[PDB]
């Protein structure tokens, strides 16, 4: 099982595994009228985004029906670079003009539901480095092989601190059946539109874990598969942000578990100097505000 | 306040500060009949323990009435090295022979209450490197200057991952008034015996945060002071243990907050190789079992 795993392998809930034998052509044939959107959330990702798009471009009008970059207020060259590589770029405003924007990653993913039309939506972060072209096929695989899977999470080898110290231990504590999930915070995952538009979306960095727990709570572990992506490189998230990320993962998880979170942000005390003679006090915002199911806003 | 702080400085709850002007002699005079124990919990600390003891030895029979190493089942030379440096060594068994031993740090600190007699107890970890001789005087300071302080936590400049990503964000969420606590997990702190023997002790790595929250819940923030220790070096805790530590901090904190923790330990999935072709599954134990107030077991 986890003693012999090759990129593409699928772990189902009942501890059973599957090693896919389809070609991308064969996968495309298995769509059976269903459509697939790929969504790349992006915020100031000009160095890496073209490369990510390039790894997926070759599928467009084949396995992948549409490829969308959801631009979350970039001020660098993210937009023009994405267009040049052949992706459709949609801003937060364009995705859903009739709702004011809130900050954070979750907002962008939620808005991408309104911008996309695929019966299946695959999310891929636009800060991946050298992403394997099979990422998307591997993620859609368990969805097209009809066995009641609605959400496909990925796992991978880092060529993790908030995952290993915050998300996974808090899941053991509060949703222990989800202890089998190797990468609960991972930005590479696929789900059915029917699932995605039926659940609230957590704000900021709470989005991935929010979706995992909501899916589990509503459909059980059987609706969730995990796919080995193998080695996955990406850009380093800055170390300063990790406390804020942890705080938001906690807020989201507590809220899903029915535990009142204070809504008070993390105050970090940053030493001004090596002697620890003064500290700068930096309070990061945290949000308890989900977005409602997209079916409540822009229903199909 | 935190804009100009020198080792020794005390932050009280009402955001007020104090810069101590006493000599160690003057502090000793202020004891007014009260006694002071220093307790060094130790587990396989033969390289560092003599040095720690040496930093405190000069106070014994003066400010410090007794210095005890609580040996938690060392199999290296911790015991003989501590004796050679002039500390009294007490095993878990010797401290409280009539109660079976449970594993973990909290057990050792709890048992040290039975082994010690001081009206004030100061805890100092035996894996400090080059600890400043004033650590103990600085920690006892706010206790001897009678203003309703019962627990003195320290803060310091690291010359932190579970503190910064787990303990402090979870405190913001569940006990936001404790957001002002810079180092909630720190092993250097002092408290009155009346407090220490009146509260349950959390197991394993939950002990420090358990005491902080119990004190806050019972006596409010006014009973808690923080003292700047300045730069504090210690030995690196191995990286593999951090998930288990986080899991226990979570269990302890949830339990104090009235939230049912599943009691399921963290399962870590450790890649066997760089390709992520197999994973080793390692499940760390977690405990939900406090020890009762020592007053219920070996009352004074």
From Swiss-Prot, chains A, B:
Keywords: Glycosyltransferase, Magnesium, Manganese, Metal-binding, Transferase. Its cofactor is Mg(2+); Mn(2+). This is Glucosyl-3-phosphoglycerate synthase. Homodimer. UDP-alpha-D-glucose binds at residues 41-45, 72, 105, 125-127, 205-208. Belongs to the glycosyltransferase 2 family. It catalyses: an NDP-alpha-D-glucose + (2R)-3-phosphoglycerate = (2R)-2-O-(alpha-D-glucopyranosyl)-3-phospho-glycerate + a ribonucleoside 5'-diphosphate + H(+); (2R)-3-phosphoglycerate + UDP-alpha-D-glucose = (2R)-2-O-(alpha-D-glucopyranosyl)-3-phospho-glycerate + UDP + H(+); GDP-D-glucose + (2R)-3-phosphoglycerate = (2R)-2-O-(alpha-D-glucopyranosyl)-3-phospho-glycerate + GDP + H(+). The keyword Transferase applies. Mn(2+) binds at residues 127, 234. Signal peptide: none annotated. CDD domains: Glyco_tranf_GTA_type. Involved in the biosynthesis of 6-O-methylglucose lipopolysaccarides (MGLPs). Catalyzes the transfer of the glucose moiety from UDP-alpha-D-glucose (UDP-Glc) to the position 2 of 3-phospho-D-glycerate (3-PGA) to form glucosyl-3-phosphoglycerate (GPG). To a lesser extent can also use GDP-Glc but not UDP-Gal or UDP-GlcNAc as the sugar donor. (2R)-3-phosphoglycerate binds at residues 160-163, 236. The keyword Metal-binding applies. Pfam families: Glycos_transf_2. NCBIfam families: PRK13915.1 (NF010496). Its EC number is 2.4.1.266. GO terms for molecular function: glycosyltransferase activity; metal ion binding. It is an enzyme of class 2 (transferase).
